Design a protein around this ligand. Structure first.
Ligand SMILES: [Mg+2]
Ligand SMILES: [Mg+2]
Ligand SMILES: [Mg+2]
Ligand SMILES: [Mg+2]
Ligand SMILES: [Mg+2]
Ligand SMILES: [Mg+2]
Ligand SMILES: [Mg+2]
Ligand SMILES: [Mg+2]
Ligand SMILES: [Zn+2]
Lengths: 129, 96, 209, 199, 81
RNA sequence: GAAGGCCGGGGGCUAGAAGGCGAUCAGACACCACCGUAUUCCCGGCCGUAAACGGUGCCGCCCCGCGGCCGGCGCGCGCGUCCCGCCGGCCGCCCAGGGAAACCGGGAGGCUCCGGGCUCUGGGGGGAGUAUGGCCGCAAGGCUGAAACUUGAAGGCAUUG
RNA sequence: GCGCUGCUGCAGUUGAAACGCCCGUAGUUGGCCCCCCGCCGCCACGAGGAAACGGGAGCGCUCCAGGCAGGCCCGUUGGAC
């Protein structure tokens, strides 16, 4: 059965980008997907998207502009100490200069740089670059 | 390794198929793996048909035929030149 | 006698119309003449090494027929590396063919900084991977002063390519030299085809060339 | 734009007619399928494609670097006339592999543009072109494979009437763009020449 | 454009980005090509010698679809309707 | 839960383990010819194994293109069991991609750029699916399942002769 | 060494390895949605509680392995954390 909506959405997006399309559809419209897409948009990877209501798990449309190379999830949400982030950074991202790791905290959804600035930790959702 | 995608038979959407017997050795073979040819021929061969017609009395008498189905196993078909061993590229051709 | 170019690129190179090899790489033109690379390297700055020499046999009606295969690399220790192979009945001609082929194909190696940006680049831009046969290679950026953490054979390639600090990981049957060198070569070749955000800037094309 | 003389020449040339089969990459150029099964193209779309291709061709300064390949015995005359009046190059007949990558071949050249009448008979050269950074333009029927095809011209490529007309129109347009012939006056050359005349 | 601590660039050269997929073109992408399209005078029939230039990567070319991408690009940069 | 096999009753034409007999052979108690018991068929009940194979676990998402067949539905017309689509199923070829390769491509893809959920199995070759225990079974046997000792290769796909 | 015990991070068509198939309990896993209330986990800070070892500030046992000294006009000389 369907479980991780975010994983299916990200996989569809990456497959569409690989053949250089411009528009995609994603059945689920969860809040977590919305925040993930908001962070992607603000950082400049996917530009625009819209949510299409239907009373039955609304659909969402997104636009592509290249740039994005990879994006995934971590299926069991680990717990990330505020001081234990460099190991995950090195293990997951290609370089320390660019890339964004998404953590969900008591202060909301943010990136590993922001949490490192506030010296707090939490749970990890995914990554992209 | 695998030599043929069909595994040497025509078996789709089933588990078991009825069996038959080879006509020259009487071996038991699955119906989807045996080699089949349909033939139609005259009872009297072609050289004596004219003599048969001249000796016949009925006017417009038509020579009756023979309708038979021959079934052979893999070993006997090869030994009697019913099929030929083909090259690796030519195994994928499916015309008569 | 003299070098009579057999190609439009060769003629343009003989003339002083083209001024840098980077001016060639930017448009992905195939190279067929070995004279083109010495013109840009008049003083023979490029190095050379012979990684391996193996003998291959073919069974025949009467005994065996033997042959020799050789692998060669070349680089100037500054962002340029090439790999090539050659096979012949005699060792020396095989080596000459391998050297010619290695010189023929050449690629630039992109380099970057680990954390602090001070001075010239000292390591690879980011994570790079290559695949040839069963062997896989991973190149990881490293801090300054870390040296080259790799086997002697791979370290030779990274030295001839002009790197100073890097971590490496290997997998598969690494005892097969050709495929290890090929995997590292492919990883290095991929370096300049990897998009990074600083290259997101939108540049209009140029009609000339 | 499209003029009555051109459309009438086309419909009497059976240029708008295609083939029973269709491809998902060529449905934009289709207007309707006849009851029998034959597909029908759009004349406006093909005319616009011809104009665009003519622009791309004239963008090349030296016409001698433009390649024309036609293994079809029907097109030989049209391609020869095309190169004669357009000062281009011809490779009629069999295409020797290595004509673009093997510098020791007697007929070795470094073209900048390649023209084809049908990939199925000429896609052997298309691969060669892909090896040497060469854009390609082709005449494509209703069903075709776009493998290294950059620009396609939807039209029938079997009947001589169709082939000669298309080449003649392309020559006319490129000449007009170059500035030799103004649009108002009809071109001195007739399409009947490009068509192979038996005996 | 990778800058140093002083903001000076240090990258050897900036390669090309495909006009359609915004993807980098490698030094060995031998199937990558670049074209140009002519601009036309107000009277027409004549060319101003200003050519808008495009480049498509090898992967998209093998995948097909270059034609439609070219059409949309032209309509974006040209009133070719 | 195939076939074979077992217990108790029926029935008894074909073929046919065992057995016998004639050839062939150096020998031939085997291949070939002939006769022929159990069995093969029915009822009730045990056994619980097969190359029980797609040698590919179940649920779920995205995915180049072409074509055939089966069932149901709908659309259009010039009404033909026409052609244009939808769902589900069985198939063939194949671009990318993957792989040691043969090859897969309705995944063996989206994976060293290496994290959707659940279950089971394996860790060089022999000894050995053996010994000793336990359970099931009328029995034949099935499930579970070592060690000592020995050994430097055994294997997979492909190339030339 | 060993990504040959694999959580990170193995393999399971052909090399060793998907139970013959179905049902099914413990067990594991479970679509979307409510703007602020209580509870569990979770993250951060804090208290409290032995030193040595380990990390680590300062001190030229002639250096060092070490030790907590030592200088004159020493933070209340110091031995912090
Ligand atoms: Mg065999
Ligand atoms: Mg079966
Ligand atoms: Mg039985
Ligand atoms: Mg099995
Ligand atoms: Mg893994
Ligand atoms: Mg193992
Ligand atoms: Mg063992
Ligand atoms: Mg096995
Ligand atoms: Zn028989």
């Amino acid at each position: 059965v369907r479980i991780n909506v975010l994983r299916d959405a990200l996989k569809s997006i990456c497959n569409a980008q690989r053949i250089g399309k411009k528009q995609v559809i994603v059945r689920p419209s969860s809040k977590v997907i919305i925040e993930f897409l908001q962070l992607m948009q603000k950082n400049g990877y996917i530009s625009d998207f819209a949510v299409v209501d239907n009373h039955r798990s609304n659909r969402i449309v997104v636009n592509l502009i290249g740039r994005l190379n990879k994006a995934g999830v971590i299926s069991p949400r680990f717990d990330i100490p505020a001081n234990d982030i460099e190991k995950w950074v090195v293990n997951l991202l290609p370089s320390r200069l660019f890339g964004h790791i998404i953590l969900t905290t008591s202060q909301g959804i943010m990136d590993h740089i922001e949490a490192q600035h506030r010296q707090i930790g939490g749970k990890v959702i995914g990554y992209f670059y | 390794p695998v030599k043929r995608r069909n595994n040497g038979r025509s078996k789709y959407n089933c588990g078991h198929t009825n069996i038959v017997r080879c006509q020259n050795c009487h071996r038991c073979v699955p119906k989807d793996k045996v080699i089949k040819r349909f033939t139609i021929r005259n009872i009297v061969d072609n050289t004596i048909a004219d003599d048969v017609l001249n000796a016949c009395v009925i006017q417009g008498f038509a020579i009756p035929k023979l309708y038979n189905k021959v079934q052979y196993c893999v070993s006997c078909s090869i030994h009697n030149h019913i099929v030929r061993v083909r090259s690796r590229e030519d195994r994928k051709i499916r015309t008569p | 006698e003299e070098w009579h170019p057999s190609t439009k690129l060769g003629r343009l190179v003989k003339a002083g119309k083209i001024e840098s090899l980077y001016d060639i790489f930017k448009y992905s033109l195939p190279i067929k003449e070995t004279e083109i690379i010495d013109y840009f390297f008049p003083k023979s700055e490029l190095a050379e090494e012979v990684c391996n020499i193996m003998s291959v046999q073919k069974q025949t009606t009467a005994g065996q027929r033997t042959r020799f295969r050789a692998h060669v690399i070349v680089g100037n220790r500054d962002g340029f590396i090439g790999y090539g192979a050659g096979v012949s009945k005699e060792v020396a001609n095989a080596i000459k063919k391998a050297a010619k082929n290695a010189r023929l194909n050449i690629v630039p190696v992109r380099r970057g900084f680990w954390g602090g940006k001070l001075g010239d680049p000292h390591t690879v831009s980011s994570k790079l991977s290559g695949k040839c046969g069963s062997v896989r290679v991973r190149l990881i950026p490293a801090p300054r002063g870390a040296g080259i953490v790799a086997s002697p054979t791979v370290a030779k390639v990274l030295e001839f390519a002009g790197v100073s600090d890097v971590f490496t990981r290997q997998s598969g049957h690494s005892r097969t030299l050709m495929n290890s060198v090929g995997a590292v070569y492919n990883a290095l070749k991929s370096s300049y085809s990897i998009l990074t955000p600083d290259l997101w800037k939108k540049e209009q094309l140029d009609h000339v060339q | 734009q499209l003029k009555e003389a051109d459309v009438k020449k086309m419909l009497v040339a059976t240029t708008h007619l295609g083939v029973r089969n269709i491809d998902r990459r060529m449905q934009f150029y289709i207007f309707d399928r006849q009851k029998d099964g034959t597909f029908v193209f759009n004349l406006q779309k093909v005319w616009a494609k011809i104009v665009f291709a003519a622009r791309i061709l004239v963008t090349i300064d030296d016409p001698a670097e433009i390649a024309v390949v036609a293994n079809r015995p029907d097109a030989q005359r049209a391609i020869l006339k095309f190169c004669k009046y357009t000062h281009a190059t011809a490779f009629p007949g069999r295409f020797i592999p290595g004509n673009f990558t093997n510098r020791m071949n007697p007929n070795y050249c470094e073209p900048r543009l390649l023209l084809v009448n049908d990939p199925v008979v000429d896609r052997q050269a298309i691969l060669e072109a892909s090896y040497v950074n060469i854009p390609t333009i082709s005449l494509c029927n209703s069903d075709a494979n776009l493998k290294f095809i950059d620009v396609a011209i939807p039209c029938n490529n079997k009947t001589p009437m169709s082939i000669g007309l298309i080449y003649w129109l392309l020559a006319r347009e490129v000449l007009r763009l170059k500035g030799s012939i103004s649009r108002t006056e009809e071109w001195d050359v007739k399409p009947d020449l490009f068509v192979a005349l038996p005996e | 454009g990778m800058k140093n601590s002083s903001g000076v660039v240090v990258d050897a050269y900036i390669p090309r980005k495909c006009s359609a997929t915004n993807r980098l073109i490698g030094p060995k992408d031998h199937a990558a090509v670049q074209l140009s399209v002519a601009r036309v005078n107000d009277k027409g029939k004549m060319i101003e010698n200003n050519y808008v230039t495009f480049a498509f990567c090898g992967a998209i070319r093998s995948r097909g679809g270059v034609d439609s991408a070219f059409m949309l690009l032209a309509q974006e940069h040209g009133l070719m309707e």
